[PDB]
Design a protein around this motif. Sequence first.
Motif, PDB file in Angstrom:
ATOM      1  N   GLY A   1       0.813  -1.205   0.000  1.00  0.00           N
ATOM      2  CA  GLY A   1       0.000   0.000   0.000  1.00  0.00           C
ATOM      3  C   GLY A   1       0.848   1.256   0.000  1.00  0.00           C
ATOM      4  O   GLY A   1       1.528   1.542   0.978  1.00  0.00           O
ATOM      5  N   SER A   2       0.799   2.020  -1.095  1.00  0.00           N
ATOM      6  CA  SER A   2       1.746   3.118  -1.273  1.00  0.00           C
ATOM      7  C   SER A   2       1.376   4.338  -0.432  1.00  0.00           C
ATOM      8  O   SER A   2       2.203   4.848   0.335  1.00  0.00           O
ATOM      9  N   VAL A   3       0.133   4.801  -0.543  1.00  0.00           N
ATOM     10  CA  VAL A   3      -0.211   6.165  -0.156  1.00  0.00           C
ATOM     11  C   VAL A   3      -0.424   6.269   1.355  1.00  0.00           C
ATOM     12  O   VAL A   3      -0.602   5.275   2.063  1.00  0.00           O
ATOM     13  N   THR A   4      -0.402   7.511   1.846  1.00  0.00           N
ATOM     14  CA  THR A   4      -0.470   7.810   3.272  1.00  0.00           C
ATOM     15  C   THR A   4      -1.917   7.813   3.756  1.00  0.00           C
ATOM     16  O   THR A   4      -2.790   8.418   3.125  1.00  0.00           O
ATOM     17  N   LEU A   5      -2.170   7.133   4.874  1.00  0.00           N
ATOM     18  CA  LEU A   5      -3.502   7.121   5.458  1.00  0.00           C
ATOM     19  C   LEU A   5      -3.865   8.502   6.005  1.00  0.00           C
ATOM     20  O   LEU A   5      -2.991   9.259   6.429  1.00  0.00           O
ATOM     21  N   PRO A   6      -5.150   8.849   6.013  1.00  0.00           N
ATOM     22  CA  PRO A   6      -5.560  10.156   6.540  1.00  0.00           C
ATOM     23  C   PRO A   6      -5.378  10.254   8.047  1.00  0.00           C
ATOM     24  O   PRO A   6      -5.356   9.257   8.770  1.00  0.00           O
ATOM     25  N   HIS A   7      -5.238  11.493   8.514  1.00  0.00           N
ATOM     26  CA  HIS A   7      -5.155  11.811   9.933  1.00  0.00           C
ATOM     27  C   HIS A   7      -6.373  12.636  10.329  1.00  0.00           C
ATOM     28  O   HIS A   7      -6.639  13.683   9.729  1.00  0.00           O
ATOM     29  N   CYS A  59       0.154  17.355  12.095  1.00  0.00           N
ATOM     30  CA  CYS A  59       0.430  15.926  12.137  1.00  0.00           C
ATOM     31  C   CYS A  59      -0.305  15.203  11.012  1.00  0.00           C
ATOM     32  O   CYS A  59      -1.395  15.601  10.594  1.00  0.00           O
ATOM     33  N   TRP A  60       0.306  14.125  10.524  1.00  0.00           N
ATOM     34  CA  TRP A  60      -0.221  13.391   9.385  1.00  0.00           C
ATOM     35  C   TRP A  60      -0.035  11.897   9.604  1.00  0.00           C
ATOM     36  O   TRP A  60       0.803  11.462  10.398  1.00  0.00           O
ATOM     37  N   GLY A  61      -0.834  11.113   8.882  1.00  0.00           N
ATOM     38  CA  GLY A  61      -0.683   9.671   8.904  1.00  0.00           C
ATOM     39  C   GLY A  61      -1.033   9.059  10.250  1.00  0.00           C
ATOM     40  O   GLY A  61      -1.849   9.579  11.016  1.00  0.00           O
ATOM     41  N   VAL A  62      -0.397   7.927  10.537  1.00  0.00           N
ATOM     42  CA  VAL A  62      -0.628   7.184  11.767  1.00  0.00           C
ATOM     43  C   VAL A  62       0.585   7.252  12.694  1.00  0.00           C
ATOM     44  O   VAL A  62       0.779   6.370  13.529  1.00  0.00           O
ATOM     45  N   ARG A  63       1.410   8.293  12.555  1.00  0.00           N
ATOM     46  CA  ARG A  63       2.578   8.431  13.419  1.00  0.00           C
ATOM     47  C   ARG A  63       2.184   8.757  14.854  1.00  0.00           C
ATOM     48  O   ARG A  63       2.921   8.423  15.789  1.00  0.00           O
TER      49      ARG A  63
ATOM     50  N   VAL B   3       1.195  10.830  -5.582  1.00  0.00           N
ATOM     51  CA  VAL B   3       2.210   9.792  -5.438  1.00  0.00           C
ATOM     52  C   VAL B   3       3.534  10.227  -6.069  1.00  0.00           C
ATOM     53  O   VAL B   3       3.604  11.169  -6.863  1.00  0.00           O
ATOM     54  N   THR B   4       4.600   9.514  -5.699  1.00  0.00           N
ATOM     55  CA  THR B   4       5.963   9.843  -6.099  1.00  0.00           C
ATOM     56  C   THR B   4       6.270   9.287  -7.486  1.00  0.00           C
ATOM     57  O   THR B   4       5.985   8.120  -7.772  1.00  0.00           O
ATOM     58  N   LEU B   5       6.847  10.125  -8.347  1.00  0.00           N
ATOM     59  CA  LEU B   5       7.239   9.680  -9.675  1.00  0.00           C
ATOM     60  C   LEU B   5       8.398   8.686  -9.593  1.00  0.00           C
ATOM     61  O   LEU B   5       9.217   8.751  -8.675  1.00  0.00           O
TER      62      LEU B   5
END
Lengths: 105, 105
Positions: A1-7, A59-63, B3-5
Amino acid sequence: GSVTLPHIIRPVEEITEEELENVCSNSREKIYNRSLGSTCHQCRQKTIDTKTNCRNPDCWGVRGQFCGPCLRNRYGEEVRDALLDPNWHCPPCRGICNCSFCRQR
Amino acid sequence: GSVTLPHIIRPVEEITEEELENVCSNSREKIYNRSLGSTCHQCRQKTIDTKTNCRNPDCWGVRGQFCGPCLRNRYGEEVRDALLDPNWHCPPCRGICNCSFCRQR
DNA sequence: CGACGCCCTGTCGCTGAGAAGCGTTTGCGTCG
DNA sequence: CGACGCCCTGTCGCTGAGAAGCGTTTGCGTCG
Ligand SMILES: [Mg+2]
Ligand SMILES: [Mg+2]
Ligand SMILES: [Zn+2]
Ligand SMILES: [Zn+2]
Ligand SMILES: [Zn+2]
Ligand SMILES: [Zn+2]
Ligand SMILES: [Zn+2]
Ligand SMILES: [Zn+2]
């Protein structure tokens, strides 16, 4: 899974007593679930126990998600106190996280 | 675009004389194109002039792309020399990039 | 190193992840 | 501050971007 999960920032008013009752006390008592679970940043385990909600808009993602034992043993803070704090920022946000990856940089 | 190229490493054998002939000399002579162009990391301009290809396998994205004037004026290196170097790593890879964002950290 | 015992009940490795570019964008300075 | 002149012909701002989690994963130590 590439993309970042929402925060998502959850206000202290939206915290329910059921969530506080599900704060993990012993890491050996966790229940793993790939669908309903959440991942702790420190131990990197996806389990269903209640985890901290970082309230920093930057803050972003699940960090910002930390479990009971990890927040207690590694940062001396209680998840219940963290969930009830309107101004609580995760250790990665404060730049004091001591997980195996952040302390490496 | 989230997404990243992808990052592709071009061997020095695959560098053609046409690409070397298209190395930008003056930044005011660049030609902008949103489709066929490439973005320089320093000036953040997407143009069609030939740009450096970072050959570090750990390198990712378009951070390694630098135009003629930017590499010359900010790092004292020639794009033609960079493209013909089998072991050339971008200034971000070497941690010496002085763009407005990297020097800020 | 994986069995057991201790009190303060615990955490690292690997993979793949790690923007990009359009817009308000181009060095220095006297000078109106 | 945007016209002009200089030589070494030039570069920052904003937005949205910035993993996540399964697997080889759990403190300390004598000791076989
Ligand atoms: Mg990769
Ligand atoms: Mg964002
Ligand atoms: Zn944890
Ligand atoms: Zn945070
Ligand atoms: Zn961390
Ligand atoms: Zn450039
Ligand atoms: Zn690179
Ligand atoms: Zn940079």
